[PDB]
Amino acid sequence: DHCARHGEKLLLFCQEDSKVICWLCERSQEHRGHHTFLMEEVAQEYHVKLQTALEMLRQKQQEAETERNQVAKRVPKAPPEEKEALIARGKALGEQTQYMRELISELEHRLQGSMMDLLQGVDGIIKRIENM
Amino acid sequence: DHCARHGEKLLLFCQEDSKVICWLCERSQEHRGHHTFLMEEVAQEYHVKLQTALEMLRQKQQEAETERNQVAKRVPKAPPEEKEALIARGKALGEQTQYMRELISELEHRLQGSMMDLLQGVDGIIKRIENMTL
Ligand SMILES: [Zn+2]
Ligand SMILES: [Zn+2]
Ligand SMILES: [Zn+2]
Ligand SMILES: [Zn+2]
């Protein structure tokens, strides 16, 4: 609830640092020219954003998994040289679906929690979504 | 010590309003376009200004009071046609010194007081003192 460096209320949010800060941080050279807001001014924008992200990921993950299970059902009938690559593909899908499970878990937490939960480090996960 | 509206520490100063305010005052629509500073950024100059004013008024006061007593001393001695004018001059001095006493008292309050006491409405009292002569 209070700034480690200044002891003032952690009520502001710095977009560039993706960090909740206090009014004295905001005046300081360390955040000079940064875009800073009350958390309450940006919470709803960020909530909407992550919500839609969560929806997109859940679908993308469902779709990945139906594909994965089709590749799984396909392995038995298939010849060897095809079998190996399909299994590799399934490996890749497993990797993807894991990654999306982690992302979905973080988005659910952030969307269920406080504003500070919502916002703190939020650029990290936004960029992880981008990097898919 | 704390903002009457937001409960935050009163550490900032609005130049257009001559008002002591907090960081939540500062960022609101009411002051966003105003020039705001930490009190501590402007305090020394204001303190010096009010001390100088105080000294100047102390001297103008001394001078008026001495004249006032010379007139008072002269009145008994005076002929009929001078007495009226003397009485009146003494009155006019009485008023001037009263006004100066009030100004001096406010300056003393401000110079002895908190930073907030110093700065709240400070442009106002400066201007009223300037206006006496000009
Ligand atoms: Zn801080
Ligand atoms: Zn920053
Ligand atoms: Zn305030
Ligand atoms: Zn103002």
Author numbering:
A (entry chain D): 95 to 226
B (entry chain A): 95 to 228
Q: What did the paper state?
A:
TRIM5α is a restriction factor that intercepts the incoming capsids of diverse retroviruses, including HIV-1, and inhibits viral replication. Like all TRIM proteins, TRIM5α consists of an N-terminal tripartite or RBCC motif (RING, B-box 2, and coiled-coil domains), followed by a C-terminal domain. Higher-order assembly of TRIM5α requires the B-box 2 domain, which is thought to mediate three-fold symmetric interactions that connect coiled-coil mediated TRIM5α dimers into a hexagonal net.
The dimer is quasi-equivalent to the trimer: the same sets of residues make the same interactions but with valence of two instead of three. The dimer buries a smaller surface area per subunit (450 Å2) compared to the trimer. Comparison of the trimer and dimer bonding interactions revealed that the two oligomers are distinguished primarily by intermolecular packing between the Trp117, Leu118, and Leu132 sidechains in the hydrophobic layer. In particular, Leu118 and Leu132, which are located at the outer edges of the binding surface, are in van der Waals contact in the trimer, but more separated in the dimer. Another distinction is that the first two turns of the coiled-coil helix are overwound and bent in the dimer form, which might indicate some structural communication between the interacting B-boxes and the coiled-coil domain. Thus, the Bcc miniTRIM was predominantly dimeric in solution.
